[model samples]
Target: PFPLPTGYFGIPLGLAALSLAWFHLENLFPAARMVSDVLGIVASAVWILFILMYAYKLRYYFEEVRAEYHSPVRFSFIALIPITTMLVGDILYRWNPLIAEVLIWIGTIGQLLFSTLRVSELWQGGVFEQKSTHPSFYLPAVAANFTSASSLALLGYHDLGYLFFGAGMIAWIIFEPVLLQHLRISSLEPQFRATMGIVLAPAFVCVSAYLSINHGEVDTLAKILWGYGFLQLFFLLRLFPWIVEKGLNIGLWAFSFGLASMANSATAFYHGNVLQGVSIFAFVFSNVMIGLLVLMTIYKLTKGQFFL
Candidate 1:
């Protein structure tokens, strides 16, 4: 029910992580650099969507709802994401651009304080329910959701960002399944849902360290614990309906799981373990699964659902 009490701190921390990817790791592979940039840009757009949408609401906070789609407070919370991200993108830019890190920090800090004020207004209104939330509190909830989706893309663009993004990311790990279960949207039919817990369980553990783990300074115990999330994902299987109907098209699921594997591998490396061998195994698993699911995720987007 209680967040860290400061969107100001959360937004910048997450972006600072993202900025590292853009600035550092984006150059990791000559081929993937393009992939990361294109995706990074797309990810930035997603953040912008929430910010602009919320900005409009802010523009007329006291006026009539912006045509049944207005909530200044909600957008205000959501705005922190784009605010930090756009700057990170700018700061992370390889081409010598106009933006500077000092400027980015200044602007983001300003927005973070603004985000806090928005949350304070909601607190004063007394609508901070962990469940049965009202429109007024939906922004904070949405903030968590955006953090989850956005962080995935952010970390994929780079490595260190994954650690920072993982902080917000762990929240989604909790919210997604819990919400699915709460809303009866979980596809829990034994074979389809049992393995979902693989991801779900470790996600909670990561968030449990929310206050304990430091982003810029992760160590042994943190890596071991964090690796558990990725480790669970290491054993993933393709139990989707498509497997029965059309054999096996691992496609996106592979990449999704692969990323999970890489995340764990990254954690092991972070812990300075001799377990690089273990992570490499997970790394290979990701590519194998990627070969299976990457095509499917891309193909499915153009046509929607598929037989296999």
Candidate 2:
């Protein structure tokens, strides 16, 4: 059997995020609902496929699964399974509220449990090397909780959404300095430089999640987060050549979730009637990037080179 990398979940995660972004766009462009519908269904299907594949691996390749779970850096990616589940739940909310609620509950609880254990381990010290820290470290607490907050907010659980939002926001504040210090002192191996795209995620996601929790109000804080996201996006673009020096590979999907979140945030601003021109540009930029990623992924799949 081929080994499956947990990071591969980014495919569905990115698709789901894009679907939600389109959902936001649908408010302004009625035709956008069709695109959102297709992407949402595709995202859900991919998520189901990955879950089945992962279940098979867990049943027959327990050792390999355990190894990834324990790996200092890789462990954060495992959180994607649940995070995508929550996003899919949000995607499904339009059609099946009951099923969507169940998925969200499962995803939320699973994310909290995983974050608790993982963060506890990190707190114990000696469990991770300096080189092990990277932007992906934000996945567990920051990304996971933000996704949870968004999903919960969509389901009309505003109070609970705020709770998770606070958790993710505080985690991002605490982790940013640590990750930046690590990056300052040590460069990531080329194979993992693609993960730098994640640097654009937390703030953009915070913008989206905050808007969700606040009922789409374009507050000062949301604007602040959006500004920071743009700064990170600029940084990523400046390093684009270096990040992709290894050329096309599945790892490039690392950029997808953040780009999609950017689109989501931009659409929210557009909906709020704030910075319409800049929002439109951000939305287009994110769509183009994710569109390119989807094409590249399809090319890789056709070449039998996608699952490495």
Cα lDDT listed for each candidate: 0.38, 0.90
lDDT per residue (tens digit) for residues 5-71 in model 1? 1132222323233333323333345754564455445445544544564456456553433322234
Which sections of candidate 2 miss by over 4 Å?
none
Q: How do the residues 66-111 of candidate 2 rate in per-residue lDDT, one tens digit apiece?
A: 8888888889999999999999999999899999999999999999
lDDT of 1 at 220: 56
Give the TM-scores of the predictions, in the order they appear: 0.43, 0.98
lDDT comparing candidate 1 with the true structure? 0.38
Error of 2 at 134 (Å): 1.3
Model 1 TM-score on a 0 to 1 scale: 0.43
Error of 1 at 183 (Å): 11
